Design an enzyme around this catalytic site. Structure first.
Site, short mmCIF file in Angstrom:
data_model
loop_
_atom_site.label_atom_id
_atom_site.label_comp_id
_atom_site.label_asym_id
_atom_site.label_seq_id
_atom_site.Cartn_x
_atom_site.Cartn_y
_atom_site.Cartn_z
N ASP A 1 0.83 -1.20 0.00
CA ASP A 1 0.00 0.00 0.00
C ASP A 1 0.87 1.25 0.00
O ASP A 1 1.36 1.67 1.04
CB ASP A 1 -0.89 -0.02 1.24
CG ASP A 1 -1.80 1.18 1.33
OD1 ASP A 1 -1.92 1.91 0.33
OD2 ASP A 1 -2.43 1.36 2.40
N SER B 1 -0.66 15.55 -12.07
CA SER B 1 -0.91 15.19 -13.45
C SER B 1 -1.14 16.44 -14.28
O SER B 1 -1.67 17.44 -13.79
CB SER B 1 -2.12 14.25 -13.52
OG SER B 1 -2.52 14.00 -14.85
N1 LIG Z 1 -8.48 4.04 -0.17
C1 LIG Z 1 -7.60 3.17 0.57
C2 LIG Z 1 -8.37 2.46 1.66
O1 LIG Z 1 -9.47 2.87 2.00
C3 LIG Z 1 -7.78 1.24 2.27
C4 LIG Z 1 -8.52 0.48 3.16
C5 LIG Z 1 -7.95 -0.60 3.82
C6 LIG Z 1 -6.64 -0.88 3.57
F1 LIG Z 1 -6.05 -1.88 4.28
C7 LIG Z 1 -5.88 -0.18 2.68
C8 LIG Z 1 -6.46 0.89 2.02
#
Ligand SMILES: NCC(=O)c1ccc(F)cc1
Length: 330
Positions: A35, A199
């Site tokens: 992430d 962007s």
């Molecule tokens: N928009 C990213 C988000 O809501 C999210 C939710 C859970 C997660 F573990 C990573 C990202």
């Protein structure tokens, strides 16, 4: 050093991607959601409330000879979808695709919210935003990338997400065989802790390119592409029968439609998202109303170049002294 790991969609919609990660000694392999929009490495564990675990693989620190409790440390995080998790912290050896970090903070969940429990395929998250967003208290911890950086051949990682197919996260090198043409680099602001960039505009289908600055974040942990309401309205206006549904929570379109592509600018370069990438399927099983992959960012407070956008590109997250982002077609 370098590392290279395959990342795999969790389902037929590419709702998220999981990458195997080795934690502890002997290794415990968990499938984590990498992430770039957060900075905590947290896992389902032997400490997670039993009623909140449903099919996930857990980390058991008591079975790792290299695990050590980070005394007094706790963590608690909320995400954009309203999900959350919290717990305590160990340090342990963590490896991704052959790249090893010793003493990595591994945040062990004591509690996770329902959306995590309900997703059997995600065993935790591996944050790749800037360490300034890490939630560990009272001593903030570094991301896996931050810890690995100095040892890497080059202080970079790359995301090469697939459309309905596996892809790759590489650490420490740029695979010049993985993209077409050249990589266009663009400036990053780290002020908010994200890979935030601007962007240079967009086009819908075969339409003319609109030059306009769109500030947003490159976020592998967000499924969809969230852009200003003006841009999103211009896109969906080209799809017969598309409408914003307050009841469903965004733009929907007839499943019989053929979606136009969406182009976004990176400097003078252009990344084209094929129409198919923007289809997230029936809103509920058997429905002929389909959910759109481009949605308004109004109310979020930031534009988000999530997986819909990123999987159309080979993306370089350059963590040099002055970070930058690179995008290439592929
Ligand atoms: N928009 C990213 C988000 O809501 C999210 C939710 C859970 C997660 F573990 C990573 C990202």
């Amino acid at each position: 050093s370098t590392g290279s790991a395959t990342t795999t969609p969790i389902d037929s919609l590419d709702d998220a991607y999981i990458t195997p990660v080795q934690i502890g000694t002997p290794a415990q392999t968990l499938n984590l959601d990498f992430d770039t929009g957060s900075s905590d490495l947290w896992v389902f564990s032997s400490e997670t409330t039993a009623s909140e675990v449903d099919g996930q693989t857990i980390y058991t620190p008591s079975k790792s000879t290299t695990a050590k409790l980070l005394s007094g440390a706790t963590w608690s995080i909320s995400y954009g979808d309203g999900s959350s998790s919290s717990g305590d912290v160990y340090t342990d050896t963590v490896s991704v695709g052959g790249l090893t970090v010793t003493g990595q903070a591994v945040e062990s969940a004591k509690k996770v919210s329902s959306s995590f429990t309900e997703d059997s395929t995600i065993d935790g998250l591996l944050g790749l935003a800037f360490s300034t967003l890490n939630t560990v208290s009272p001593t903030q911890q570094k991301t896996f990338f931050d810890n690995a950086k100095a040892s890497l051949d080059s202080p970079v990682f790359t995301a090469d997400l697939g459309y309905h197919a596996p892809g790759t996260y590489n650490f420490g090198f740029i695979d010049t065989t993985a993209y077409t043409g050249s990589i266009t680099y663009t400036a990053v602001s780290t002020k908010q802790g994200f890979w935030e960039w601007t962007s240079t505009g967009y086009a819908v289908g075969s339409g003319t390119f609109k030059s306009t600055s769109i500030d947003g974040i490159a976020d592998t942990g967000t499924t969809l592409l969230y852009l200003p309401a003006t841009v999103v309205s211009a896109y969906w206006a080209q799809v017969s029968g598309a409408k914003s549904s307050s009841s469903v929570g965004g733009y929907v379109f007839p499943c019989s439609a053929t979606l136009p592509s969406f182009t976004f600018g990176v400097g003078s370069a252009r990344i084209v998202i094929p129409g198919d990438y923007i289809d997230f399927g029936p809103i509920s099983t058997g429905s002929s109303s389909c959910f759109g992959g481009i949605q308004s960012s109004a109310g979020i407070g930031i534009n988000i170049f999530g997986d819909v956008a990123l999987k159309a590109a080979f993306v370089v997250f350059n963590g040099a002294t002055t970070p930058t982002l690179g995008f290439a077609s592929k």
